[PDB]
Design a protein around this ligand. Structure first.
Ligand SMILES: Nc1nc2c(ncn2[C@@H]2O[C@H](COP(=O)(O)OP(=O)(O)OP(=O)(O)O)[C@@H](O)[C@H]2O)c(=O)[nH]1
Ligand SMILES: Nc1nc2c(ncn2[C@@H]2O[C@H](COP(=O)(O)OP(=O)(O)OP(=O)(O)O)[C@@H](O)[C@H]2O)c(=O)[nH]1
Ligand SMILES: Nc1nc2c(ncn2[C@@H]2O[C@H](COP(=O)(O)OP(=O)(O)O)[C@@H](O)[C@H]2O)c(=O)[nH]1
Ligand SMILES: Nc1nc2c(ncn2[C@@H]2O[C@H](COP(=O)(O)OP(=O)(O)O)[C@@H](O)[C@H]2O)c(=O)[nH]1
Ligand SMILES: [Mg+2]
Ligand SMILES: [Mg+2]
Lengths: 428, 426, 428, 426
């Protein structure tokens, strides 16, 4: 019943920092590993120290060093903290090939070591970003190997969705297009969120006009914990990760369920307001709490999964579902009946001490696969196209051995993906 | 992970004098060589620029090069000239005299072998080089002449390392050498294809900033080179220190170069205003972005809104929200969409470091690659042609063996960069 | 059994401030929402805090900020407090169109959120003023949307009737004429009062020669509470809001019942004087207590509703009615028999601590639809005409996209309305 | 929500010197720049006129413009000249000399580009502008000349913001420049159609008030400009602070302008009487209304009962009953019905603020738009014609290129405003 977390790149690792901090908060784990009390994620020592079963990869020493100098440096095993010396430079060509390919063997052997520590490997999940060099480059490299060795294990990916308006990486389209090509075909499911959309959540629901990544990742951590801690904890409907895959992936392509999370409420907003299960789920179908800037009303739904924490009575859930099925404007694709996975944990929602979110007594996470995602690809299509037509920055990949045909090909694979969304949109 | 810096020419040597001063400030390293700081980070990534010698002495990983001992001596005589080891002073005797031919082609060429040997010794001293940086003037004899020669050999030895340089570009009003455009032309001919990137610094623009926004009436070159070092140090510290974004020089280079030949940069810097107004300033991300975008805060005598922007890098130092930065950069892109090139979606890229420059709460470095740069090339090329036809001072150069057809090709190559900027100006 | 209050504009909000203060006084609600004890208006939290189901709209931050800095800032949910940055400028053209139309979507979504919080939405009521920019401009904009979404719910409006003698808004006729045009057709019933008439009440019955709006709105609040708090509380004849509409609106045009309220008595005037139900109702048919400067004797009655608080025995009421039907000079329109709605609540009348009105043991509110209202329209007709003939101030509307024909049209709609009153006056 | 103010000309600069002083008084802001007040409201809406700079420094959102450093210097030298940032002092060198042509048409025109750039920088610093206000003289070179030029460009950039200005109108007795009516004529020609509204201040009337009711025998311009600032500050504070009525400047503009071209105002102020009588005065609403209606308390040398009143605004500061205000305004309307225009029912409008001016219990600002205003235009137009025929000083103006037919059209336009007042005088 075990799983592995993999943190690649800054985004992967810094999100991971929040994630493991939250898992410590879930059980009262001390920075040194001492836990007085979740062995699905952790491995126990004779001292009662538990080791989070995870791998941290950075090709630049700095971020891992940040871990190594922080409080959780005692928690993590030195072998889990893997670092190279040089970067990918925002560039798949080095991340996947030239540079990252050198260290990956080590990385894999640490993974395999942990796989041998697992007794019942259920699977794993990889945290990264769609635009970066290691964030997406190295990441796909890893998938190429992990899908061989662990072909039957859960291969869930979580990635930051490139913001349409702000991006620090000029060749991000190129990176992301190459990842599509290689991740679609290897991964089982990839989830993503938009930091821009999140900012809007922070300013509207948390009332914060100063979000940093350390805020943004707390919110992400919430979502992740709902599906990682609480799915291993007790509930009414205990849903596994393999079950998630078995209930969220409808086609052999990928699919890309997007996150939505409600409650996201400031302490003051929690006052004077009573949420019910149904009210929280109402919020879950509002564009306003959509974690990716993509309009839910534009597309049609294919999948939807609702996962519940704390004070949730199935009775209320059932009523809530009835209304979301019938009251809303949620259009859905023919193919699908509304079999929405309901996970119901008794495990209460948790809050980070010193965080922004209010203590809540119940909480709902929503995953959804909508046809509007093709518009996200359309965004990438043109951004890629523009650059590629001019061949701007192309020498930074070509010099590492990339082929122009390959890039065209990858775009075409994306186009095919868009076409399949088109297909799904056609009802039948 | 490490960088080697080489300074050359009177300009380069005096700029470096301020650069290294600042780097040691950043890390709390005393003018005599030992570390007396007070932050963990100060020693933590010191490796990129210093070798720790026995006794907790730090040796700046740089070579000081000239062809006149006196300049070197003056550098050595001040604080931080003592931190450099004698072995990093490589110099000859008898000038160059601001003559490319002497510097590159003949006499200075002789010295380069000893310089390179020391370079090799340092390349071995490093664990893993990220790259090299050189400081020099484009119209100078050793600055450009000898310096260029060195660059071609270093690149040859290390194709896989970053080769960049910052250079003083002849200002429209103050040229010193009559053939300063000639030397510059020759350096383009050699440098552009033998470098990964070059920065364009105009002293005239710098003198305007120092009075325009800083309202100062006494600067010297040390004060202006302080500003230069602010941009240089801004770039590498992030690479050195913990941040949020993506803090690698090579990645910067990748994001800023859309085409193999067009790698010229316009540095700018914020905040950068007089003390009077400091009581009336607010420190926000939009505040920095206002100063960064404004052409008057550029250190290059160009005008980015005249040309088109190919790439923009915004580097931030200090605690800022990601949201705010993202939004303001977007806003910039939006409002100045008429200057950006349509081929590159979201042409403004960012990098974020959480360490502020000593004494400030926040700061930002503007790096741009516009088409406007071509105007500098045009000015030089034109001036060159006139001189070319007359052979002004070319007897000095041809006397040392420089052939006019090589110069002819150099002229073409200048014109080629302009035409390629036009090709992507659209 | 729930309802929503909507406060638009200063007038709407400042009146609302008095209204919600009174509701707090009705039940002992603390500024923080803590109530130790009316859930038709309030929504309960797990802390026992109740939230008044209402929306506050101001396009200028200031008045809402006044709320936000007062004691009731803890009572109101931050999302209920909606503010823009700029004003309508006394002008429908911006209030309804150019400016207010931008924010209204937010406003509506907060309303809809509350509508979803309601389980049995009975309806709602809107507080505003006939002359202002948001007071009437924005207001009608809202009705345009609310009448679609909540077509079957109560749409009661309350508005300040422009004083014939004092008005601070030079284009008030124009504003009010445009509202007629758009409110008549959308709203169900609009009530109004005249601050000038009220001043006369304050100086004659309360003996106060210094009324401010904070006095004036207390009196309004009294009237409103009689029909809002006490209609949800227990009585003999418990009358609902929908019942009010069903008992006050005789035609599909609008109608405009005017308020009259007796007792309005200073503490000293209460001494030495014993009011009965009948005596209070006698006062209700006196011009002297008419809350709008319009002569009750001029027109004919069409509707009349009497709502009773405290110590009222139907026995006495019946006798009182007999005398008002037969003793008075109240002429009434043929169409109507005298079926006057009698609401009889046991719920006692309440008084604001530190207010002007005397503690009373019983109280009567009167609503009435008289044909004299056409004279009010006549006032507007000429005021509008004068301005419009000269085309004074017209550029302040035209520049926002208003049409001159439209203005003529709106006047004509008013003329038609006057003609329908004429019609009703003709007995048949 | 915010306002930008620009001062120009010696007049405008000295008026603004008092205006800003008062605004800071209102908010408890020290002459050096920091906030040392004591009321919540004092900081709460400070945004409309101040930027808070780092350190709790407040920067007045205004630009000081002149063509002689010395006037600017004298402003800067006093308290509150230190609160302005150096960047708000935009000036040239060599006067204008009270010459429209220089100011507007030629030389001053050159400076305007730098002024506007700063304006743009401030427009960005604001979250949301409500509008702009300018202070100047109608017969002055930079006051009107250059100022007008600026206005035409600001309006162009921001059609959707309020553009108003307060200006010193040539008094019948004291003209300084021989062609002061010429400059004024030209400013009407330009301003009227390039502004939303303008206020008419007569120094002669002001000197009468200061002795007539205030019984003072020593005023200077600073004392009279205090009175000016009382009216200016009166208007905007309400907009800033909590009140009862309708406190928006644009709404004021809407209520006061019945016709696109007739937007001239007569400011007045109450209470406004000597200390002796202050022991014999009662403070009631009728008391303020008596002072407001009385023509002698007008700051414009007009006579509202000679003309007809188109619109009246009564702004009140401090706690007053609504009833009393309503009734007294009605009474005014009733008793002075012979002066009001019959086309506008209830032509007297009110606005109420609950914050009194510092030191007073209550106060009121009178704003009127009568037809009587046309008399000022008539005086100017006539004087103009005489000068026009002789070309007095027009060689200075035509020497700088101002054409006589432009002036001819300006004359017509003056006459047009008069005829339109007649058209609505009836
Ligand atoms: N939510 C979130 N997004 C982040 C975080 N850090 C970076 N990102 C986003 O991820 C992308 C940045 O990737 P980089 O940091 O440049 O690169 P990397 O993927 O770590 O790998 P390299 O390019 O080789 O350094 C941008 O789109 C950022 O907006 C973080 O902590 N949280
Ligand atoms: N009874 C009562 N009447 C009020 C109150 N405030 C204002 N009024 C009246 O309502 C009208 C004023 O509307 P304004 O305050 O100018 O405007 P608004 O309707 O809030 O909206 P804007 O014009 O955009 O500011 C006048 O006729 C006032 O006499 C109040 O608190 N109580
Ligand atoms: N910013 C800057 N420019 C310098 C300095 N010294 C010389 N220069 C510039 O360099 C050019 C002259 O070249 P120089 O450095 O004397 O050449 P070299 O010494 O023979 O290599 C002129 O354009 C100067 O403005 C300096 O310390 N700072
Ligand atoms: N109220 C008032 N009027 C002034 C002041 N200064 C000059 N004036 C008037 O302005 C006119 C002269 O224009 P001036 O301001 O010198 O023009 P400029 O300086 O060339 O733009 C005369 O009618 C003066 O009465 C002042 O400080 N207050
Ligand atoms: Mg990284
Ligand atoms: Mg208002």
């Amino acid at each position: 019943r075990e799983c592995i977390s993999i943190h690649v790149g800054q985004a992967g690792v810094q999100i991971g920092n929040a994630c493991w901090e939250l898992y410590c908060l879930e059980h009262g784990i001390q920075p040194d590993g001492q836990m007085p009390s979740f062995n699905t994620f952790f491995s126990e020592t004779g001292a009662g120290k538990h080791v989070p079963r995870a791998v941290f990869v950075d090709l630049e020493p700095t971020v891992i060093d940040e871990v190594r100098t922080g409080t959780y440096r005692q928690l993590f095993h030195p072998e889990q903290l893997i670092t190279g010396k040089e970067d990918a430079a925002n560039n798949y060509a080095r991340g996947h090939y030239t540079i990252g390919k050198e260290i990956i063997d080590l990385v894999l052997d640490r993974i395999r070591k942990l796989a041998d520590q697992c007794t019942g490997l259920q699977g794993f999940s990889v945290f990264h970003s769609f635009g970066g060099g290691t964030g997406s480059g190295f990441t796909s490299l890893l998938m190429e190997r992990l899908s061989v060795d662990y072909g039957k294990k859960s291969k869930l990916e979580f990635s930051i969705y490139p913001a349409p308006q702000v991006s620090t990486a000029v060749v991000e389209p190129y990176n992301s297009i190459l990842t599509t090509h290689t991740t679609l075909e290897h991964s089982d499911c990839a989830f993503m969120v938009d930091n821009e959309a999140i900012y809007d959540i922070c300013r509207r629901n948390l009332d914060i006009e100063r979000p940093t990544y350390t805020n943004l990742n707390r919110l992400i951590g919430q979502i992740v914990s709902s599906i990682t801690a609480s799915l291993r904890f007790d509930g009414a409907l205990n849903v596994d990760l393999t079950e998630f895959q078995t209930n969220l992936v409808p086609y052999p392509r990928g699919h890309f369920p997007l996150a939505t999370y409600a409650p996201v409420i400031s302490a003051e907003k929690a006052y004077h307001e009573q949420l019910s299960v149904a009210e929280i789920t109402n919020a879950c179908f509002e564009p306003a709490n959509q974690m990716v800037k993509c309009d839910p009303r534009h597309g049609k739904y294919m999948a939807c999964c609702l996962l519940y924490r704390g004070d949730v009575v199935p009775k209320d859930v059932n009523a809530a579902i009835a209304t979301i099925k019938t009251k809303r404007t949620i259009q859905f694709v023919d193919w699908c009946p509304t079999g929405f996975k309901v996970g119901i944990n008794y495990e209460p929602p948790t809050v980070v001490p010193g965080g922004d979110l209010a203590k809540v007594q119940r909480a709902v996470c929503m995953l959804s696969n909508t046809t509007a995602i093709a518009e996200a690809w359309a965004r990438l299509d043109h951004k890629f196209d523009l650059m590629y037509a001019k061949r701007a920055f192309v020498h930074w990949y070509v010099g590492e051995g990339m082929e122009e045909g390959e890039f065209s090909e990858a775009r075409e694979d994306m186009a095919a993906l868009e076409k399949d969304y088109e297909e799904v949109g056609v009802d039948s | 992970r490490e960088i080697v810096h080489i300074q050359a020419g009177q300009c380069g040597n005096q700029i470096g004098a301020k650069f290294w001063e600042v780097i040691s400030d950043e890390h709390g390293i005393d003018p005599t060589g030992s570390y007396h700081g007070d932050s963990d980070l100060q020693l933590e990534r010191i490796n990129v620029y210093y070798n720790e010698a026995a006794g907790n002495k730090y040796v700046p990983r740089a070579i000081l090069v000239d062809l006149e001992p006196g300049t070197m001596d003056s550098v050595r005589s001040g604080p931080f000239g003592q931190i450099f080891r004698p072995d990093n002073f490589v110099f000859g005797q008898s000038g160059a005299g601001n003559n490319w031919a002497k510097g590159h082609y003949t006499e200075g060429a002789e010295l380069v072998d000893s310089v390179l040997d020391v370079v090799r010794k340092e390349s071995e001293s490093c664990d893993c080089l990220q790259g090299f940086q050189l400081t020099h003037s484009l119209g100078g004899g050793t600055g450009s002449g000898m310096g260029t020669l060195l660059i071609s050999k270093i690149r040859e030895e290390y194709p896989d390392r970053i080769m960049n340089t910052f250079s003083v570009v002849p200002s429209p009003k103050v040229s010193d050498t009559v053939v300063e455009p000639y030397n510059a032309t020759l350096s383009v001919h050699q440098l552009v294809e033998n470098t990964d990137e070059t920065y364009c610094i105009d002293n005239e623009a710098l003198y305007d900033i120092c009075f325009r926004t800083l309202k100062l009436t006494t600067p010297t070159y040390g004060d202006l080179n302080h500003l230069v070092s602010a941009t240089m140090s801004g770039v590498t510290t992030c690479l050195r220190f913990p941040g949020q974004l993506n803090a690698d020089l090579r990645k910067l280079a990748v994001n800023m170069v859309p085409f193999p030949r067009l790698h010229f940069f316009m540095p700018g810097f914020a905040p950068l205003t007089s003390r009077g107004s400091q009581q009336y300033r607010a420190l926000t991300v939009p505040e920095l972005t206002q100063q960064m975008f404004d052409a008057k805060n550029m250190m290059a005598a160009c005008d980015p809104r005249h040309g088109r922007y190919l790439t923009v890098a915004a580097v931030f130092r200090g605690r800022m929200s990601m949201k705010e930065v993202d939004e303001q950069m977007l806003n910039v892109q939006n409002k100045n969409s008429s200057y950006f090139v349509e081929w590159i979606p979201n042409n403004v890229k960012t990098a974020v470091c959480d360490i502020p420059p000593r004494g400030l709460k926040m700061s930002a470095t503007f790096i741009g690659n516009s088409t406007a740069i071509q105007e500098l090339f045009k000015r030089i090329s034109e001036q060159f042609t006139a001189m070319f036809r007359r052979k002004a001072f070319l007897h000095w150069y041809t006397g040392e063996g420089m052939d006019e057809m090589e110069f002819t090709e150099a002229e073409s190559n200048m014109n080629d960069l302009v035409s390629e900027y036009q090709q992507y100006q659209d």
